[model samples]
Target chain A: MYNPVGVAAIGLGRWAYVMADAYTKSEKLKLVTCYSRTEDKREKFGKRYNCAGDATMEALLAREDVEMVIITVPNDKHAEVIEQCARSGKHIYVEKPISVSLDHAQRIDQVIKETGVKFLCGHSSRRLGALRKMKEMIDTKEIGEVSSIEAVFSNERGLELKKGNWRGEPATAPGGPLTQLGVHQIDNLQFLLGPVARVFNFGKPMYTEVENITVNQTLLEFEDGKQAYLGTNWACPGVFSINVYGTKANLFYQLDFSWWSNSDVTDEHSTLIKREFANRILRDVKVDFESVDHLRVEVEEVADVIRNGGETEIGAEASLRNLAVVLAAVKSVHEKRPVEIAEIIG
Target chain B: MYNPVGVAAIGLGRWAYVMADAYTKSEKLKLVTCYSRTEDKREKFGKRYNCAGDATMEALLAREDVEMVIITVPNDKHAEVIEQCARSGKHIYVEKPISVSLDHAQRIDQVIKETGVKFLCGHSSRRLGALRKMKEMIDTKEIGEVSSIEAVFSNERGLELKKGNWRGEPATAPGGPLTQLGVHQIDNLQFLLGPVARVFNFGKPMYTEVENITVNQTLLEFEDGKQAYLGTNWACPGVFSINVYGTKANLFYQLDFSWWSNSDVTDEHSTLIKREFANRILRDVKVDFESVDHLRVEVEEVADVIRNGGETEIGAEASLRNLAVVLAAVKSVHEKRPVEIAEIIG
Candidate 1:
């Protein structure tokens, strides 16, 4: 009989439901509990997942059955929940950004290290089939040397924010969609290329009319001299696209936020959508990713690492570095300047 | 008949020959003379253009027929020739990158402003039909609001560099292909969009085997919060491409550095190559440009401006700013850091 790791879905928000479903579907993990400050929300979440409800965070962490915790709370509350989880000796998986502030993020990293708890960050975009194939192409030299990258991950999300919401405030959201959706591109850039040595981000709030940054144009200079430019917006129509240019070939991947792959059985569409060569006709390059649940892949990867004794593809150091890059970007916007990652990480 | 402006082609190098041909074809300009230190090259250039050959530059300037000077000298010698031309009261048309250093460029600008002589820098790429089409689309709001731009203008000219060549030296080339070919893209960016407020460039001397930086990746932050990323290489084969992304649509143009129109017929070729939009099937956008001599267009524009007394599309401020951006980028590479354009320009 195979042993299953115990999992707890903390903060019963919309994303928490995703974590709960991922845990429920994974054979090597069990959804043991749902933690929430409100008793009604906690019980409702637990009933939906066939798990127990723990109104108090302490009550949820005290359970020996809850070996792992998935944090999906608002950005500001992350440090409090993560520190408590580390003290209670539980492995952790936090959503993208992990935290908006470097101080809070550093505290979380220190606590996790001191406790020796396994940590997996929610950079779910890394698990996308198209991006993985791109990484593979770059590794195999099919695309030759990657000289630069240009990406866009924007949507009409500014219309979704309500007044008095935690995300609407600059203190919690930092640069609004920067930590929200921009972190995904930041992590993706780091994942595809090596570490970034410096970054300059230009931000503006036009249509959103919010104080926080609703638009971002970030320039990344990697340690190896390769560079990536990320342009994101919250006041425009949805667009999730990435273009990787290399010496030998180029890879272009784009799709609506909801769609993953390029096509279905009849047309046999691919997710990479398009690939072009230096001297040849462009190919309709497609990598299928629609059928698989990205959340499930992330959950299984985390479970396998915890149960089978290994590390994630990005590992702990990268997760921390990724967070540091975003934090530096936050500062870049606030100060209206290009920021060095060393300033934040060191 | 359009009043023709008297013109003298300085230097008998390859680019100077092209300028001679342009003036020869211009209805409003006369190729009156050729000036060069080399007797053989000067005579050869004169014979080629059916103009008089003058071994001494002072003799060429003394002629009342030489009302204007087209400078195509080596980059380091721009200041020396421009100073003489400004003193001679001759209208000037120097090649793109009016000067290498900021101090020299600023001096040239001051001299031109004080002398009140009409000046035109050779930013020939601006005359490309496809690029102009892109500008028109942006102007008409066809592509909606442009958020970002990505471009590349690279060729395998590094392999042709000889020992002791000024272009092979770091002082002259600065960021190698950046100042050489990268400036054209910078000028184009400014022409299509607006002024650049900040810049961070990564340059590496790989494959070219020269001490000077040959591979360049420059990030541009426009004053209005728009951004541009330029990836250029002299060590690689030729490639000229630009992609303009906006809220409603996107414009992509790529060719072998010869074609520029986005569409065409007959020869089964098009210049404005590919135009894509949201939820619509891809259209092979083609704009014919073979009949248009970009050089002649620039010449006429300059002549018309000089005769009609109007400003060039890219004003003196924009031209100076573009050069400053490249200079700052060179500094960024030398110090192994991201440089602020303000530091260089101020």
Candidate 2:
């Protein structure tokens, strides 16, 4: 396509590693650089990808060929690495739960706004085929107005048995499942339903013996007077789920794919867009964007956004809205009441 | 198990014929009498079910062995038969649209309470395997106290083709699908959740030529602070679907079994009960409580109330409440506002 842009993924955790692997597979980009918090990880990932390691923050910033950085590091480290990317005049792609604090998010926002380096955060929902096809379907007015939206992003986790739960820490992550897992939900909500004018959120511990975890529910009022709800949880074992309800029909996107196939787990969700008004059977599509591997597709889109001069699907403004939604959820939980969107987010 | 309780099923229409056929096959009931506004059809169905045909209501009312009188008549005629049943010392099993008027419902309530005969109104949802399974699951406390529920009953009705239609004639059917098709949803709400404390309703015609035939949505609040919603439309083409959501898990029951199955066009229903909380799959036996169908399970139970019994699973009391729910939906539609249960039924 365009001149193959240089790409480097700095946060080498599980998601970053999986994303880095997928990013290398993109035709417009190559995994040219790698960085890790530890020397062993940086060297191992570097050797495996045939790229050199950036063992130190200083060394990583000096690399001129690394045009963009995908930060998948822990929440506390986001501001530092993102600031480095800004100072170095390179683009940034940080995995979601962008930062643990709004101050940190604002700092990163300030740097990127000032430096004029493109910034994209991890809300890979754009890569979901259901969202794309549904967007097209909505544009066509086939399902009428997107009156209401409902979603569930459930993947049971404990630090011991979870695929990932480091973000559950209150200091490391602002909200539990609502922020870490709900980042995608926030992006998709804004993307599908337009701006949420008001919100009422409630979060509770559905399953305990876990840390500061929760199953969260937020009642959101769209700008169109359409009401919606989003439920995020980590007590059901595994898989992700999302359902979008419009006036004419409804759409359901399972965040995991295994739930559709031979498995008996609620944890495996592949994005399924169900038009409730028409058609008797839930149409199965092979090329659906909502396949359980939305994370993989998200990785691809991040690469595409960085390599070419394209707008990031999940921008800072929308990410901030998502964070605000999660914060409202936490406040509602603490106050034992419905928290207004205006009270918390401007 | 019990001796086939002598039964008389009034209104020998398509639905009536199905209910009669179910009664014929039931080990606890016998089709002893039949009534129809149309003499010819009454004679025909009476001949088919080996029951005596009566040309007039009083003549049918004279039958003593007809201990369980099943009413599947038009909406306007519900009170007439139930009154006759109470006077005749017959248990009442009236198919729904239970009564056209709330006052008539209360009046019938007074008489039924006075008659002291076992009474159940047929809201066959009591027999639908999915519904039975739902009651089973909820009673088991598997999902915890259900916080909210959403349900939809949609079907294609070429209303322009049925304008001035018998089904859409408010004078005849009272409140369109909310009375006819929506009774099923009311049973679901009462069965799974409980009494309705509040309702917010919206309805509008989907087509210009359909006259007053409009689709509707009703939001219900339970006394215990739980919430339930019903989305109903005859405008949506293709599918007839019902989905139940609980705080513990969700279940989907699509009426269509197979796209190409031999029974797709036939009235055979393939049923399944899935547990989302535990991820277990259990399908009930191929239960065709043929006489009772979906409504008569409760109708027969009411019959027991009239004849020999304790409480009705779907009795006159439940029917009164259900009819009240449907009426609130209609009132909300007409007033263009939310209707509270206390303002109406209470």
Candidate 3:
């Protein structure tokens, strides 16, 4: 808060670059150093970004100026990096899927409370223009009481192959769809509403590409007695959309960024129908240059929290209930039964 | 089975013309004579429709041509008309909210069972378009297995009403929006999902302009381990919309029929952000349509049943479970507490 925060970006992969670029672009943030385990790679990113470099993990954490660390490391290394940062008294923003397992993530609960290091997990959807606007619409009772709701974070992300394709790895993802991107949907819903009570769900790994990679279809039972149905997928050929529904109206926001950015991107971003506080069908409500990068907006909100002392726009404490939903989906997947929220959150 | 089915429209008001007109258009039905204690009105309708001579109370049902009677009577008179129609061998299609009173509705129920002429209560959403498509979508696994679902019918009809309007009269249109319009949503959701086992609810009468007009929000705990929310409102000031959320994907349908032709006109329709089966943010999918008047489609299914001596599409027997939800809503409204379906249906 006193001086521009000391920042270190600790991975230089494609995703790392996107986020680091955002950090570089942000006025409140100062890029102090860049680190990668591989010396060759560290030099490559350092030359690209024109930033000072650290060759080793120990060296980076030792830098007196490294007050904060942003880790975009592989899934297996999340807990280790968080532990390193927490022990070093550095605040952190760890890429989502917080850790591969709840058991692995549980250690953070113990250490984080004890250490009090400021922290944020990815699930970037919490800062979107349409979704933030959608919440305002609900609060204002524009579409009347939200009768029913649905959220999906489906993508052909299933089509790509990574190292181990841990995206489809059971031990890594634990629960499919519901957790994969459902954290995005569930967190935001919890953001808008309150907590989830109980739900019924079903999941199956529909892809022959990977064994045991199932999708989760869940019916949400909210604390205030609302109900919702949701679908998460790694299977079907090519479908992608996220939607929310209400009694009197609906709020729809779908991503066509890839298409809008390029003509050949023949994807689902073609139409998004959001009937606003809705006296007339909501059309012509524009998505401007400032609003489209939902993730970037999310980064800005989180950065604001770090800069000033206040509740985060989308913090982990606010998302614990959503975490419970994701875990419950996993429990259901294992038991072949619809598990209640208490089973997981407790 | 061989005899001509004699049918009667009870209220002989606006809704009555729609049904009577349908009767002329329907190959299976014949409008014998209508009963309206108001003689001038009855004579005018009878002359306009080219039907049997207009008549009074005893004389209307006593006419030898009157075999099937439909009641569009005032709520308080639903019981009275059912009794008359039962004795006269007339089938019924009373508007939703069988009676403003559970005791009265049950009384009609008792008489209908006692007389055994087929009876169909008006829950027209049983015949609406999007809902019918929902059945198809779910069955084909277009949206995949329905682990859960939600249905909503909220409107701003109260915005068009005065304090003591006909609808606000508890004796006339009891149960307000939840009963009048919401019962259709309740019934339709139950039709899609199996049975609503338990309920948690919130209901209130919100506007100063409308007295005794209630808005109810209920969560249905289904026997199949799913849950759904039904939100019925009298002041949405928005179009009629119901969203069906499922496992693999989500579908939304909107209806904005001009109020002047509300009883008969085709609604302005749209499905916002219908996604690709399993892809991310692709494009809005246009729903397929063969013909409109989903009511006719349902009626044709029922007619096929009658013609083939098979089962009715939405048989009153299968619908007893749905009626259970409606019954629960009434109890919940009256008692200001959630009432389980088993408590009443059993």
Candidate 4:
């Protein structure tokens, strides 16, 4: 095996620690440095990971030992961090939703193309064992010509949101749960089916005390004429599920969202069942798959791409499309009509 | 205990026989006569029910023993049967979707008011055990403030549709699986929630050789600001489920659709589970409910109304609103936009 690639962490938030823990367990990546605007958080994070603590992004990017950077910054700050990391000629792994708005997302796209650095967007849901098995079954026609899908990702975070937080602001969060949670579902849908052609969405601020809308639902039509519904709510307890309907069978996947952060054990807490038609009756068949560390798998892919010249499973292009779907959904909700993907990306 | 109310069967189709068998078990209703355009089917139904066989609608309506007529004719012929029975001073019990078109539905309403006969529309899904339990929980706030719901009813009948069948024609079936299957969900939604205010829908014909659209999905907005989704498919194995989301908990209900015709045992093949949030984690709690015969209950309600001079649980006005939702969904699919209920009913 080759030596571990040197990687630094930016924005030492909760998600950053989660990824750093995954890095400590991975043989392909090593934590070399970390930076955050907050001194206490960065110092504690650096001490926990046994890495150098930098006060500014400039100092972290100037490090000679830093080969790549993992970003978990605020939603609106993604473009700034991505630009600096790309210009430093460092490979990057950022969280889902490349940027909150289309304008900033375009800037990230241009900078990444100019720098030619390896990149991976953290859409780790598709790496779950159940989801991977679903992809395999669909590809093999084991389910037989998928016609529709339904996905929902929800939590009670909005109930705990306070005033002045970035997540409670409309500009930063866009469609609240749509950006923070539904983006993962958008990625999963596009990965399972093809590209989304149109979107019809609805949102309202029902249970949240913040200005950001907490309940969001979107209807999507794929390019190949398949249909899907993606619902994200901030007013309920955590739930993550995807149901794929096919001509011969239907697959239902559910994850224990309380175990969402612990990637190594997440798959063990999830279940997938296939309902097949036989004897003119539907029978539930339990599906078996290998458990996997979702975060570790994605991080290792970025390490491989940085060391050997290759692309990631979910790169900037696919990630941008995922963000486009969110933007299209936001537009649809505002306009009270269906919005096409071309309108957002063009 | 009340004496049996005399009733007649207007259509000798499969559903007519299903209802007739329920009458055989019900002590509150008596089958006095039966009629169909075809003589052989009506003779078989009359012999099976120990009722008189009438050759024409006039002969059946003229019978002194037939105080009410149970109309199970094709969707488009509902108005003709209802009007004839209503003007003959007979109470009416028609199947789900009072009529296919809004104009015909309105005509039935006008004729019913002019004749002043007690009427009951058979939207029997709401009579299922799981649905009744859900209604009780929602009304008692056991699930807390409700926000959204999803309902689906599907069968493989579309896969078996022939080119010449009424279900294969748009004018007769309207939305194919939608009018034939989805109206049950529409009535169920309106029964649990309030009236539907708007609908956005999409439908397409796939996996079927017939001209009727096989897959239909509709997004609905209730008058109280709650939202819902209704999906009906004709290309998949039979499946029926409804999920209600609330602030404190969520309720999931699923029925074995293969046992749909056998109402007495349908609840035994069904399940209802409540997912409640406690200690920051969601846990499933099994919910127990009493089972009842869905078709027999509705038929008995009609008998009670006729003998007691009171309203049935689901009457002409509520049934009219249910039909309006279906018509609005069909309009939304055609216009590629959200259609308001007022636009259809007014």
Best by the lDDT measure = 4
User: In the order shown, what is each candidate's alpha-carbon RMSD?
Assistant: 4.9, 6.6, 6.4, 1.3
lDDT, residue B9, candidate 4: 90
**All candidates: DockQ:** 0.19, 0.11, 0.10, 0.63
- Using alpha carbons, what is the TM-score of model 1? 0.81
Across residues B127-167, which tens digit of lDDT does each residue of candidate 4 receive?
98888889999999888777788888887787778778878
DockQ, cand. 4: 0.63
Q: List model 2 lDDT by residue over A223-252, tens digit each.
A: 666556666655543445555544456565
DockQ, candidate 2, comes to: 0.11
- For each candidate, the alpha-carbon lDDT, in order, equals 0.73, 0.63, 0.62, 0.86
Q: Cα deviation in Å at residue A184, candidate 4?
A: 0.8
Kindly report the docking quality category of candidate 3.
incorrect
Query: By summed lDDT, which 10 consecutive residues of candidate 3 chain A come out lowest?
Result: A260-269
User: In model 4, which regions exceed 4 Å deviation?
Assistant: none
Q: Cα deviation of A297 in candidate 4 (Å)? A: 1.1
- Give TM per candidate: 0.81, 0.72, 0.72, 0.98
Error of 3 at A227 (Å): 9.5
- Over A1-346, each residue of candidate 4 has an lDDT whose tens digit, in order, gives 7789889998889999988777679888889888888899987998898889987788888887788889999868888889989999988898888888888888887888999988888999999888889999999999888777889888777877886678888788878989889998999999999899999887887776788888877889999998888888888767788988788888888888878789888989988989988648678999999988999889899888877878998877788899999888888888999999999888
Window of ten residues with lowest summed lDDT in model 4 chain B: B273-282
